[PDB]
Design an enzyme around this catalytic site. Structure first.
Site, PDB file in Angstrom:
ATOM      1  N   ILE A   1      10.438 -68.294  32.633  1.00 59.41           N
ATOM      2  CA  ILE A   1      10.585 -67.064  31.851  1.00 59.41           C
ATOM      3  C   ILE A   1      10.213 -65.814  32.619  1.00 59.41           C
ATOM      4  O   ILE A   1       9.450 -65.851  33.601  1.00 59.41           O
ATOM      5  CB  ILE A   1       9.746 -67.106  30.535  1.00 59.41           C
TER       6      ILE A   1
ATOM      7  N   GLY B   1      -8.677 -44.344  46.766  1.00 60.26           N
ATOM      8  CA  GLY B   1      -7.814 -44.699  47.890  1.00 60.26           C
ATOM      9  C   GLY B   1      -8.204 -43.949  49.171  1.00 60.26           C
ATOM     10  O   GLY B   1      -8.098 -44.498  50.286  1.00 60.26           O
TER      11      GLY B   1
ATOM     12  N   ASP C   1       3.867 -64.794  29.880  1.00 61.11           N
ATOM     13  CA  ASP C   1       4.062 -64.829  31.347  1.00 61.11           C
ATOM     14  C   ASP C   1       2.811 -64.398  32.113  1.00 61.11           C
ATOM     15  O   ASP C   1       2.914 -64.108  33.324  1.00 61.11           O
ATOM     16  CB  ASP C   1       5.260 -63.938  31.717  1.00 61.11           C
TER      17      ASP C   1
ATOM     18  N   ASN D   1       0.220 -40.027  43.311  1.00 53.67           N
ATOM     19  CA  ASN D   1       1.606 -39.585  43.160  1.00 53.67           C
ATOM     20  C   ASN D   1       1.722 -38.061  43.284  1.00 53.67           C
ATOM     21  O   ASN D   1       2.477 -37.432  42.515  1.00 53.67           O
ATOM     22  CB  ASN D   1       2.167 -39.979  41.784  1.00 53.67           C
TER      23      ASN D   1
ATOM     24  N   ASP E   1      -8.482 -51.480  35.300  1.00 50.11           N
ATOM     25  CA  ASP E   1      -7.334 -50.762  34.744  1.00 50.11           C
ATOM     26  C   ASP E   1      -7.508 -50.599  33.208  1.00 50.11           C
ATOM     27  O   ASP E   1      -8.639 -50.549  32.713  1.00 50.11           O
ATOM     28  CB  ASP E   1      -6.056 -51.565  35.080  1.00 50.11           C
TER      29      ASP E   1
ATOM     30  N   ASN F   1       7.309 -69.979  36.246  1.00 42.22           N
ATOM     31  CA  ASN F   1       7.775 -70.809  35.121  1.00 42.22           C
ATOM     32  C   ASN F   1       9.247 -70.465  34.913  1.00 42.22           C
ATOM     33  O   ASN F   1       9.916 -69.993  35.856  1.00 42.22           O
ATOM     34  CB  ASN F   1       6.898 -70.580  33.863  1.00 42.22           C
TER      35      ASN F   1
HETATM   36 CA   LIG Z   1       7.556 -66.200  35.014  1.00 43.33          CA
HETATM   37 NA    NA Z   2      -8.608 -45.624  52.285  1.00 45.48          NA
END
Ligand SMILES: [Ca+2]
Ligand code: NA
Lengths: 63, 281
Positions: B79, B169, B41, B155, B32, B77
């Site tokens: 938070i 995909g 976090d 999308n 990504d 946690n």
């Molecule tokens: Ca958390």
């Molecule tokens: Na696929």
């Protein structure tokens, strides 16, 4: 309006002008056709995919 | 106090958490835009960047990879949010720049890095309308090597009877994930086609954002990491299950929704997937 098939094969400049008349708050980003991009949906965004001549190579759409 | 985003509850991840399974020791590559490793976090275990002009995979200049990572593995946690697999070993494999885009070769290099580094799961919340032979070969190689590969369906919404699922995909070796909302209705933007495999929450999904922020994003990008995180939960409970078995477990235990052209097999249910015997609810 959320898609502009009539813009394919036009210049990137004309595409920007037309899209901003229809959607003045649009966040336009120009990217090379044939790249991979993030799969998030942004109702304010219009990506414009251009060929190496800077003409539109794919139907512009909101997202 | 920590909050559990609705989508984590909707796929029944808390049932795994209560059994004691949270994705411990499972390696998940988020392929990504990078992951902000300073976020309190998130815990990022490692990574690499394939973007020539952005060499730090722990700097996310877009925000998208950080949000996707939080849905996979935001920490348990007091938070922020809770991730699907909050103990997973999270890897930032940066293949997209600040503008959200990457060359096919960058994505392929990231997939190869994931294979060479023994990742158990790849999430690709990304895509494009055309394939390439080299792209198909990289995802097929990862799957042949034992990796569970999950990707956003895209999308592109509907287009009559045509498939609108993007690549990677759309390749049979990759699990393509569409988006539903909290009522199990398909999101109007969610791609469709016989290649759509399963659905997960992808509307108003709260997660981590760079600079110690949180926010709600929309997309099949948001749905994909529910499934990648579910795969990590399943492997933490069944560490010898192959990718073949993890994939079938998720497919065979969905809650069926509408026609498969629009919904695939339905909404994933990781509680049911992680049992030995599988059926749809
Ligand atoms: Ca958390
Ligand atoms: Na696929």
């Amino acid at each position: 309006k959320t898609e502009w098939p009539e813009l394919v094969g036009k210049s990137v400049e004309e595409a920007k002008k037309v899209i901003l008349q229809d959607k003045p708050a649009a966040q336009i980003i120009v990217l090379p056709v044939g790249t991979i991009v993030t799969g998030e949906y942004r109702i304010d965004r219009v990506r414009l995919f251009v060929d190496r001549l800077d003409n539109i190579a794919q139907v512009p759409r909101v997202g | 106090a920590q909050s559990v985003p609705y989508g984590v509850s909707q796929i029944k991840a808390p049932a795994l958490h209560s059994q004691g399974y949270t994705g411990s020791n499972v390696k998940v590559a988020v392929i990504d835009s990078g992951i902000d490793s300073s976020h309190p976090d998130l815990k990022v275990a490692g990574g690499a960047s394939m973007v020539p002009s952005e060499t730090n995979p722990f700097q996310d200049n877009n925000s998208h990879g950080t949000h996707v990572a939080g849905t996979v593995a935001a920490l348990n946690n007091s938070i922020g949010v809770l991730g699907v697999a909050p103990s997973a070993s999270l890897y930032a494999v940066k293949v997209l720049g600040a503008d959200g885009s990457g060359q096919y070769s960058w994505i392929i290099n990231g997939i190869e890095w994931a294979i060479a580094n023994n990742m158990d799961v790849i999430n690709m919340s990304l895509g494009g309308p055309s394939g390439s032979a080299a792209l198909k070969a990289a995802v097929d190689k990862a799957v042949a090597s034992g990796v569970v590969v999950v990707a956003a369906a895209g999308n592109e919404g509907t287009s009559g009877s045509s498939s609108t699922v993007g690549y990677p995909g759309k390749y049979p070796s990759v699990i393509a994930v569409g988006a539903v909302d909290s009522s199990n209705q398909r999101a109007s933007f969610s791609s469709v086609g016989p290649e759509l495999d399963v659905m997960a929450p992808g509307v108003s999904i709260q997660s981590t954002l760079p600079g110690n922020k949180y926010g709600a994003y929309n997309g099949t990008s948001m749905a994909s990491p529910h499934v990648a995180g579910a795969a990590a939960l399943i492997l933490s409970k069944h560490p010898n299950w192959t990718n073949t078995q993890v994939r079938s477990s998720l497919e065979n235990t969905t809650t069926k929704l509408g026609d498969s052209f629009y919904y695939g097999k339905g909404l994933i249910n990781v509680q049911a997937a992680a049992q030995h015997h599988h059926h749809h609810h």
